[PDB]
Amino acid sequence: GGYAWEDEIKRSWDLVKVASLVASIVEARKKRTAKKNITPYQRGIIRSLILTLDCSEAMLEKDLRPNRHAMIIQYAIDFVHEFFDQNPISQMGIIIMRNGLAQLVSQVSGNPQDHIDALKSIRKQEPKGNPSLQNALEMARGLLLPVPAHCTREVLIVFGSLSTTDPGDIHQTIDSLVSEKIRVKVLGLSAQVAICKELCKATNYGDESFYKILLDETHLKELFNEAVTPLPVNKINKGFTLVKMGFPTRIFEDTPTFCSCHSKLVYGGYFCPNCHSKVCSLPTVCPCCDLMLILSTHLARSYHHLMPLKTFAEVPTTEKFRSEDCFSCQSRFPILLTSSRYRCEDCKQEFCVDCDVFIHEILHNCPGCESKPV
Amino acid sequence: IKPVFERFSSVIITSGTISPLDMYPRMLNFKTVLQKSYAMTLAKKSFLPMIITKGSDQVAISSRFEIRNDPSIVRNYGSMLVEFAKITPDGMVVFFPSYLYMESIVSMWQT
Amino acid sequence: FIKGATISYGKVKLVIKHNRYFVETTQADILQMLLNDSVIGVHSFEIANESVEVVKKRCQEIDYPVLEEYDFRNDHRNPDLDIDLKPSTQIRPYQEKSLSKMFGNGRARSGIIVLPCGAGKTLVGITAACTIKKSVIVLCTSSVSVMQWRQ
Ligand SMILES: Nc1ncnc2c1ncn2[C@@H]1O[C@H](COP(=O)(O)OP(=O)(O)O)[C@@H](O)[C@H]1O
Ligand code: BEF
Numbered sequence A: 001g002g003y004a005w006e007d008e009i010k011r012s013w014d015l016v017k018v019a020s021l022v023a024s025i026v027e028a029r030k031k032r033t034a035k036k037n038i039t040p041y042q043r044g045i046i047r048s049l050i051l052t053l054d055c056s057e058a059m060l061e062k063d064l065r066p067n068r069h070a071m072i073i074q075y076a077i078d079f080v081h082e083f084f085d086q087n088p089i090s091q092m093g094i095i096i097m098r099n100g101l102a103q104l105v106s107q108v109s110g111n112p113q114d115h116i117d118a119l120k121s122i123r124k125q126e127p128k129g130n131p132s133l134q135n136a137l138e139m140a141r142g143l144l145l146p147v148p149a150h151c152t153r154e155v156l157i158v159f160g161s162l163s164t165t166d167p168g169d170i171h172q173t174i175d176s177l178v179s180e181k182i183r184v185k186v187l188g189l190s191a192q193v194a195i196c197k198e199l200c201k202a203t204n205y206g207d208e209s210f211y212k213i214l215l216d217e218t219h220l221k222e223l224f225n226e227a228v229t230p231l232p233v234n235k236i237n238k239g240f241t242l243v244k245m246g247f248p249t250r251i252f253e254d255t256p257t258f259c260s261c262h263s264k265l266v267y268g269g270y271f272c273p274n275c276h277s278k279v280c281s282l283p284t285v286c287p288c289c290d291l292m293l294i295l296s297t298h299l300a301r302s303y304h305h306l307m308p309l310k311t312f313a314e315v316p317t318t319e320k321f322r323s324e325d326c327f328s329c330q331s332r333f334p335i336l337l338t339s340s341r342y343r344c345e346d347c348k349q350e351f352c353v354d355c356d357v358f359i360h361e362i363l364h365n366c367p368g369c370e371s372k373p374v
Numbered sequence B: 001i002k003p004v005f006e007r008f009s010s011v012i013i014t015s016g017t018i019s020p021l022d023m024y025p026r027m028l029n030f031k032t033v034l035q036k037s038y039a040m041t042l043a044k045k046s047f048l049p050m051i052i053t054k055g056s057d058q059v060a061i062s063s064r065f066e067i068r069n070d071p072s073i074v075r076n077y078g079s080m081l082v083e084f085a086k087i088t089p090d091g092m093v094v095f096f097p098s099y100l101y102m103e104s105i106v107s108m109w110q111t
Numbered sequence C: 001f002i003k004g005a006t007i008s009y010g011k012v013k014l015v016i017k018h019n020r021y022f023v024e025t026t027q028a029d030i031l032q033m034l035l036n037d038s039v040i041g042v043h044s045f046e047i048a049n050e051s052v053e054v055v056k057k058r059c060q061e062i063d064y065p066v067l068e069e070y071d072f073r074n075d076h077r078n079p080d081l082d083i084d085l086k087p088s089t090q091i092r093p094y095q096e097k098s099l100s101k102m103f104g105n106g107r108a109r110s111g112i113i114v115l116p117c118g119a120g121k122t123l124v125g126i127t128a129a130c131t132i133k134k135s136v137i138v139l140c141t142s143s144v145s146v147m148q149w150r151q
């Protein structure tokens, strides 16, 4: 019955005793494999998203430093900014589950400032009680009723607990959501939940990829950023329609005038092309003739989604190269094992790694394709 | 079971959890032409068995019926049940060795 | 510097019989050289109990220093005290490491363990006594601390 002391000494120093570039390429190729498949799926540019956040005792856990409540709220602010930058026409609403009830914190609108301010106020609020998915969903269902039909209803629940206390049968709400054509995306924090999986699958036409649980702090940001982009629509669902809209002209005035939207003195504004009423900022529904005023730039931002730029394929090392320098940025390709040259299929012009990421994330048009004369 | 094996020529004795396979031929007198167990080729670890032998306070825990009313053992099981209930999403099944043991433990937990 | 003092480890050994100290060694040639010296006064010889400190220092002075190892497992003539740590007790990491060095070879060896005040040297000593499973005597600086050791 001897103890571990008598056996031997650990001898820690015995444990320690005394290709990267190709590894990066193959790792990039494996990552690029997921990006190889891309097709112009039809996506609803106009959308209405109700953001539901869990503010309950489960948020007091220190899994995400400093606490789940702080990180979720902070990343929510970033999501609000990103969501309204990529999609200018869309509107958003904020709900929070606290004390076993769903509490509205900001009306569904198209002003990012209002939603940002609402989230900022929630910072100090201390989470408590149990969450209630049914109460949040019922409140979300009501909020998404006045929204126009052409808009695609969307719910993005950030669930953090493992159990839900509802006053009624949540299964009825799931059926009701499907009837109203509402798609729910759930970002779990700890582990899978049976009801959450069913809600996402039922509302997403059987797709099970809309319920995701993160595995570390870094993965949360990627999940938040993914929801920014619009979701594709199914073939069976039909929502084709026209929407009346107008483009107002910025007007400069020496004397400030009352704004129809807020009834406040503002030096400048945009004159509506129907009722000539002035609105402080865009894009918002006109306060008088309720036609959504927008600028041509707002429509432009969403064009790249309709016709995404085809992914580039790395050239084989054996084949010859078009030139020794990048077409766009003129950066010499390192001589190095495997050539680090990427060519666009349409125009067949090589590009560097920096251009490949830039030409598919920020810049949405291949420089070579525009240069090619037809 | 002697008439069964003498009457029917071929008998397939299958079960999800049946081991060791050599005991049943001994306990029940019959001969087997083939007997084996199949390992499951699983991409990832679908199940995580664990053999808990101590509580948080590093005190051995056992369900011996003669020490069922032991505050140390009772509390360690109680804390174990609560902790697994906190992290378990939907379902948690607890199996006790005997019904009388279940009654005594539950009564102690309630107090 | 390291080479010189790394070879004299285990040439001379000291053991304790009933009440007589025998400074013996398995080999017979080396001890003969040691005995020739007038300072000291398989071979085993009984040495005066009072003059034990004199030889211990002398062995340090000479190239071969005295080793202090005691195989508590082998000898059962001395009555054994049956004691073990309570189930609730648990040894801390550094306490476990410190005691492991003393019993690295499986046999207790004399030495000094230095831990910061409040580290728990009392528990280290208690564990050391328990594993040896022999009679243990504790000498302490003050009576108040003697009561602390008892408790
Ligand atoms: N493993 C342990 N767990 C809990 N308390 C411990 C442990 N080891 C030591 N202690 C505590 O450390 C304190 C000081 O121990 P003591 O042996 O008096 O320290 P010192 O090294 O100054 O002689 C005591 O209160 C004792 O209970
Ligand atoms: F080092 Be202790 F305070 F005895």
Ligand SMILES: [Zn+2]
Residues within 6 Å of the ligand: A259, A260, A261, A262, A263, A264, A266, A279, A280
């Ligand atoms: Zn205004």
Ligand SMILES: [Zn+2]
Residues within 6 Å of the ligand: A272, A273, A274, A275, A276, A277, A286, A287, A288, A289, A290, A291
């Ligand atoms: Zn108008």
Ligand SMILES: [Zn+2]
Residues within 6 Å of the ligand: A326, A327, A328, A329, A330, A331, A351, A352, A353, A354, A355, A356
């Ligand atoms: Zn480039």
Ligand SMILES: [Zn+2]
Residues within 6 Å of the ligand: A344, A345, A346, A347, A348, A349, A366, A367, A368, A369
């Ligand atoms: Zn191109």
